[PDB]
Amino acid sequence: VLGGGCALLRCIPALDSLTPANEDQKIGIEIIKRTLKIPAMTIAKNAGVEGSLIVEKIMQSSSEVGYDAMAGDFVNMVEKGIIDPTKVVRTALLDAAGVASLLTTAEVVVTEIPKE
Amino acid sequence: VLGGGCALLRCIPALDSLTPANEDQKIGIEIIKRTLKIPAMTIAKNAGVEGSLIVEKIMQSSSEVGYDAMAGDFVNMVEKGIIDPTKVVRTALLDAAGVASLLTTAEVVVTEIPKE
Ligand SMILES: Nc1ncnc2c1ncn2[C@@H]1O[C@H](COP(=O)(O)OP(=O)(O)O)[C@@H](O)[C@H]1O
Ligand SMILES: Nc1ncnc2c1ncn2[C@@H]1O[C@H](COP(=O)(O)OP(=O)(O)O)[C@@H](O)[C@H]1O
């Protein structure tokens, strides 16, 4: 799939066709929708530029256009060879979402008093 | 002049017609150019939205269009009555620049040892 975090960016419209059952499901869908922009924003931020503007310009462009952080310009990722294994992307997303969702369901935390 | 910080945003193109004498003058001009976006970003950030995208959309729009943070949409500033006294804007910019530029020319700081 496209590299640079654009694979997850192109999946944002797929979340607008969902119908949440209740308000909490809508909250969760919005959480995932906001999260989908994080990899591209982080890659742009590490390059010394503003991640928000880069992500906005990526989303306003055509489906084959993304951002080359190394060169620092908007290019065709398949043509330039910035591609990612789809297995890696889906595995990372699934694991991150699964663990963090369960973490965010906590109300009480029990730890051990630091004897040593 | 236009309110919401758009008056300073519209002065960014006026800084592209300058020819710096040397590299340090270019650095100072770039500092002012980056600073000119700050009021609009701060107003947008206090409104709970992303300031960078708001400022980018303001700059890509026509000269009479700005952002209504109270309503939360892009409107005509003069028509909606979001206007600022030009004296206030120029005074704020002049004082801030004058003091901060002198502050940024320091290499040594001498203070009193805290006896009490
Ligand atoms: N030249 C480039 N331009 C834009 N994005 C890139 C470029 N090279 C790699 N990337 C992106 O950076 C990510 C790789 O970062 P990396 O440090 O390997 O993180 P991870 O260990 O999570 O894969 C990939 O998702 C890839 O899409
Ligand atoms: N409805 C609005 N939409 C957008 N910007 C506004 C609105 N109302 C006021 N502003 C902007 O907010 C600024 C006023 O902020 P304020 O708290 O008075 O700061 P200051 O004391 O420095 O003037 C003005 O520059 C004005 O342009």
Side-chain angles (χ1 to χ4, degrees):
Chain A
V1 282
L2 296 182
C6 312
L8 288 184
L9 272 186
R10 301 312 175 173
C11 296
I12 289 181
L15 293 174
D16 303 348
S17 64
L18 294 185
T19 302
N22 42 69
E23 179 63 39
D24 307 304
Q25 306 226 359
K26 182 158 66 234
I27 291 178
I29 294 170
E30 294 322 298
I31 284 174
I32 285 306
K33 189 173 315 175
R34 280 193 295 263
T35 308
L36 280 188
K37 306 183 183 64
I38 290 302
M41 248 168 240
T42 319
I43 291 166
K45 176 196 167 167
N46 281 350
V49 311
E50 184 68 47
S52 307
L53 301 183
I54 295 300
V55 167
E56 201 50 57
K57 196 160 178 301
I58 286 165
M59 283 183 329
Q60 294 310 316
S61 309
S62 58
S63 180
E64 80 275 334
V65 158
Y67 181 66
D68 193 318
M70 203 33 195
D73 50 6
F74 289 81
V75 297
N76 199 311
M77 329 279 306
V78 182
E79 171 181 299
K80 300 293 178 162
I82 314 170
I83 42 187
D84 269 15
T86 165
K87 175 179 179 183
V88 168
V89 189
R90 68 163 177 82
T91 289
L93 177 71
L94 190 43
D95 285 274
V99 182
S101 320
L102 190 59
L103 158 69
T104 55
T105 56
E107 179 72 26
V108 179
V109 177
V110 187
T111 57
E112 264 178 275
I113 281 179
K115 54 176 79 66
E116 300 295 326
Chain B
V1 283
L2 296 182
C6 312
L8 288 184
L9 272 186
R10 301 313 176 173
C11 296
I12 289 181
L15 293 174
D16 303 348
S17 65
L18 294 185
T19 302
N22 42 69
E23 179 63 39
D24 308 304
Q25 305 225 357
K26 182 158 65 234
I27 291 178
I29 294 169
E30 294 322 298
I31 284 175
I32 285 306
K33 190 173 315 174
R34 280 194 295 263
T35 309
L36 280 188
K37 306 182 184 63
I38 290 303
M41 308 222 309
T42 319
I43 291 166
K45 176 196 167 167
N46 281 349
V49 311
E50 184 68 47
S52 307
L53 302 184
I54 295 300
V55 166
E56 200 50 57
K57 197 160 178 302
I58 286 165
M59 302 231 276
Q60 294 310 317
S61 309
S62 59
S63 179
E64 80 275 334
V65 158
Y67 180 66
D68 193 317
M70 196 40 164
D73 49 6
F74 288 81
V75 296
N76 200 311
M77 308 270 96
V78 183
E79 171 181 299
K80 300 293 178 162
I82 313 170
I83 37 179
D84 269 15
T86 165
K87 175 179 178 183
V88 168
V89 189
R90 69 163 177 82
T91 289
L93 177 71
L94 190 43
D95 286 275
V99 183
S101 320
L102 190 59
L103 158 69
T104 55
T105 56
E107 179 73 27
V108 179
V109 177
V110 186
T111 57
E112 266 145 313
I113 281 179
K115 54 176 79 66
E116 300 295 326

